[PDB]
Write a protein that binds this ligand. Structure first.
Ligand code: HY5
Ligand code: HY5
Ligand code: CL
Ligand code: CL
Ligand code: NA
Ligand code: NA
Ligand code: NA
Ligand code: NA
Lengths: 234, 5, 234, 5
């Protein structure tokens, strides 16, 4: 790979520079290079990996949604025929998005998840796996199998997190938030989504008297997003 | 519905 | 080129879709493809070309400034030595930025400027030429020749605009705004920058009773930026 | 100093 000649520590240093410069494509490339050195990632390094690809795919998702919206209106009654360009360009963005998801999933499978034994790394990577199958599901039309893959990854992450992490652990909370969104937006299970978000919120509240000052802002933010969703859903 | 932004 | 098989009208349509999706790299590629069909661009098409590349290079410039700032502090007394990574990554962004500027300048020279006879197209393209030499000047350290190229392009644009356009024409105003910034930021001529901005503002004020409703917001915005700069500079 | 954003 193009990063094969760069020191691991240099890749990490440049990923942090790319983050400061909001150069997320570069950041992802540097972190892919770091993963491919074959050593496990630290907590800080996992965060760099996730933020890089989250921002890359986030921009692709936002663009895909803009184009898909334009495409669907072009297929409403009364809409003037305009040729294949909207579909073509939506497909172009879609294919690029799928390629990024496939790249992330390949890294997780080679071999981050295999070597992750600690709960904090294993749940983190399985959550990522669920997240990127979910992003694939958003554009899939095939779709059932992708949805099943997302659910299986989220479920294994959930089982570990509940056995090995306190309720206010930010990774546990962020997994529950995203799995509840999966239920609501992807899997047509709004009641499961609401139940998961509420149980997660309530149990985190009762655990707050143990939560570290370190993690307070992360976990409070995610708790507020759980609350925001519940307000939106109920 | 929101995930972390 | 990769866009050689796509219809000109399809390239324009996809450039507009890319703009809506904030996919500026795609937008620039589509508009480069359109220019390379060999026909002159309309007013609307020139705007698409300029906005696409403005946003591409804008992001590169913002990243370059972040990295250069980190680099200069690494060279202050007391700064811990950290290796070549900051310089290397700044150089990477810099080279990419220069490549985009070179691409724009090549399009302007092949053959947009040559075939542009109307004042509105010729001033537009010469302003672009000054702008992208200016962006090259910002990272140059060589620099004098690039600064001279920017000045020559801006000056020819200025001479045409004053002979052929009313003072409130938005292209004339935006050229004067950017040329005044060139004087202040690039050419070490703050007094020339202030004189140009003030003369431009004052003459546009006296012409406002002729300005079209079409162009009122564009020209008022640029007039406010001239005023903002003058407040910053005086 | 600002140019159009
Ligand atoms: C390594 C360097 C950088 C700067 C990139 O790190 C980024 C963050 O990484 C940790 O936060 C992560 C984190 C957050 C938190 C919510 C950011 N919090 C705030 O906005 C508080 C209001 C101030 C969003 C991210 O997408 C990230 C990395 C992602 C995950 C997510 C990962 O699913 C695989 C599960 C939860 C959350 C968990 C893992 C959180 O712990 C730090 O604690 C934060 O300080 C730090 O900003
Ligand atoms: C073709 C489709 C799209 C949507 C991309 O067009 C964009 C704009 O193109 C014309 O505006 C151009 C224009 C503007 C104006 C200031 C935007 N005004 C506002 O924000 C008003 C507050 C509401 C900034 C751009 O960078 C652009 C294209 C650039 C130039 C600049 C080009 O140097 C080579 C010189 C002046 C300005 C001149 C050329 C202005 O006329 C329209 O008039 C605008 O409506 C329109 O938004
Ligand atoms: Cl396309
Ligand atoms: Cl580099
Ligand atoms: Na090493
Ligand atoms: Na068409
Ligand atoms: Na044609
Ligand atoms: Na170093």
């Amino acid at each position: 790979g193009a990063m094969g000649s760069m020191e691991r520590a240099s890749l990490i240093q440049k990923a942090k520079l790319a983050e400061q410069a909001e150069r997320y494509e570069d950041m992802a490339a540097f972190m892919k290079g770091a993963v491919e050195k074959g050593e496990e990632l630290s907590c800080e390094e996992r965060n760099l990996l996730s933020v890089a690809y989250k921002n890359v795919v986030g921009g692709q998702r936002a663009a895909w949604r803009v184009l898909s919206s334009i495409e669907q209106k072009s297929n409403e009654e009364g809409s003037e025929e305009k040729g294949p360009e909207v579909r073509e360009y939506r497909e172009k963005v879609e294919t690029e998005l799928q390629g990024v998801c496939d790249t992330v999933l390949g890294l997780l499978d080679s071999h981050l998840i295999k070597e992750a034994g600690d709960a904090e790394s294993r749940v983190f990577y399985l959550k990522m796996k669920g997240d990127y199958y979910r992003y694939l599901a958003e554009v899939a039309t095939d779709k059932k199998r992708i949805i099943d893959s997302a659910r299986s990854a989220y479920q294994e992450a959930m089982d570990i997190s509940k056995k090995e992490m306190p309720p206010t652990n930010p990774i546990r909370l962020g997994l529950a938030l995203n799995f509840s969104v999966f239920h609501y937006e992807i899997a047509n299970s709004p009641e499961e989504a609401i139940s998961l978000a509420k149980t997660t919120f309530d149990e985190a509240m009762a655990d707050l008297h143990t939560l570290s000052e370190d993690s307070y802002k992360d976990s409070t933010l995610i708790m507020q997003l759980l609350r925001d969703n519940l307000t939106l859903w109920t | 519905s929101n995930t972390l932004r």
